[PDB]
C-alpha cells in the first residue's frame, strides 16, 4: 500500500536515447554523453591490464567499435583518463547538457538510473528510468551484464555518475553484527572524475576480487529513527553506543544532532527478530533507507 511506498519525487529528465549509446567491441556497454564528451569505461576492451592495453591499443581499438561513428565523435582526440575513455563530440551541443552533482560520492538518498534499451514491443530504442537508493556511490538498482554506462542522478536531476560494477554478495566487517548475515548484492558507481568508493580505485576494475561492506545500504537519520522506534519507544535520553559506529558507521555527532535515542543492547539482544520482522509492512532494510514513512 501507499503506507510502505517511499513514493519519491524525481524531477523528470528530458534526454534523448542517444545520450546513452550502446557501444560494442568485437564485449559491450553504454557510453555516457555528458556535456560535449562521451565517456566509455575502459573495461570494454578487457577486464585485465594486459587484455585491455592490447585491445585498446593506444586508441586504435576504437576503430573496432560499433555505434561509435567518426561522424559523431572526434576519435583521434580520445583521451584515456584513469579508468575512463573520454572522447569529444564534434558538435558539443548535439546532445543537450545536464546538471552535475558537485560531490557525488558524498550523496546519500534516493536516485534514478537511466539506461538505453531496445524495446521489442514498440520496435525502437528508448531511454529507461529506474528508481532506487544510493549511499556514497553504492546503490540498490538491479543491473545485468552490459548495463555499465547507465547514468545515475539525484532527485533534482544532477548527475552522480555511471554504473560500473557489482557483485552477487558482499562480505560484512568493520567483524561486526552484520558479519553473520545469512545474499546482499552490490551495485557500484564511478564518477566522471574517476571517483569510486572501493579500495584501490586507480585499478579497481582490473584488480578487485571482493566487495567489502560495513553494513546494508542505509541513511543515517533513517537508521536512527528506526532504531529508536525498535528499542526506545518513549525516546528517553540514552548515551551514544560505540557499536553504532562499528555496526552502522554512525558517529556520535550525528546521534546527538538528530535526537533519536537508542537502547542498542535491546537491538543486539533482539537482532534477529528486528531485522527479519516488518515495521508496519516495511522491511528493516527499507526503513533504514527511507525512514518510517509515518
Amino acid at each position: 500500500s501507499a503506507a510502505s511506498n517511499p513514493s519519491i519525487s524525481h524531477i523528470v529528465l528530458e534526454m534523448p536515447v542517444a545520450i546513452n549509446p550502446l557501444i560494442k567491441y568485437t564485449s559491450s556497454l553504454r557510453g555516457a554523453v555528458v556535456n560535449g564528451y562521451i565517456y566509455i569505461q575502459r573495461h570494454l576492451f578487457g577486464s585485465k591490464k594486459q587484455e585491455f592495453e592490447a585491445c585498446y591499443n593506444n586508441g586504435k581499438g576504437l576503430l573496432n567499435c560499433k555505434n561509435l561513428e567518426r561522424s559523431k565523435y572526434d576519435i583521434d582526440s580520445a583521451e584515456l583518463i584513469g579508468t575512463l575513455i573520454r572522447i569529444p563530440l564534434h558538435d558539443k551541443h548535439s546532445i543537450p547538457h545536464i546538471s552535475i552533482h558537485p560531490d557525488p560520492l558524498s550523496y546519500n538518498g534516493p536516485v534514478t538510473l537511466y539506461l538505453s534499451r531496445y524495446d521489442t514491443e514498440l520496435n525502437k530504442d528508448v531511454l529507461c528510468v529506474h528508481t532506487g537508493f544510493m549511499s556514497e556511490g553504492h546503490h540498490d538498482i538491479k543491473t545485468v551484464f552490459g548495463d555499465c554506462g547507465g547514468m545515475l542522478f539525484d532527485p533534482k536531476g544532477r548527475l552522480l555518475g555511471l554504473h560500473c560494477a557489482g557483485s552477487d554478495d558482499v562480505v560484512f566487517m568493520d567483524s561486526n553484527i552484520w558479519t553473520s548475515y545469512k545474499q546482499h548484492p552490490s551495485e557500484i558507481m564511478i564518477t566522471l572524475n574517476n571517483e569510486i568508493n572501493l579500495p584501490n580505485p586507480a585499478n579497481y576494475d582490473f584488480e578487485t576480487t571482493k566487495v567489502v561492506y560495513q553494513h546494508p545500504l542505509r541513511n543515517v537519520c533513517a537508521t536512527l529513527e528506526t532504531l529508536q522506534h525498535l528499542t526506545n519507544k518513549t525516546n528517553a535520553k540514552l548515551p551514544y553506543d560505540s557499536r553504532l559506529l562499528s555496526d552502522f558507521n554512525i558517529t556520535a555527532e550525528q546521534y546527538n544532532q538528530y535526537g533519536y535515542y537508542i537502547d542498542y543492547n535491546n537491538f543486539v539482544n533482539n537482532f534477529n527478530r528486528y531485522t527479519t520482522t516488518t515495521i508496519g509492512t516495511k522491511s528493516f532494510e527499507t526503513c533504514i533507507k527511507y525512514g518510517l514513512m509515518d
Binding site: 556497454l29 573495461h43 548495463d147 557483485s167 576494475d205 578487485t208
Partner: peptide, 4 residues
C-alpha cells in the same frame, strides 16, 4: 567480483 565483476564489472558490468
Amino acid at each position: 567480483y565483476y564489472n558490468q
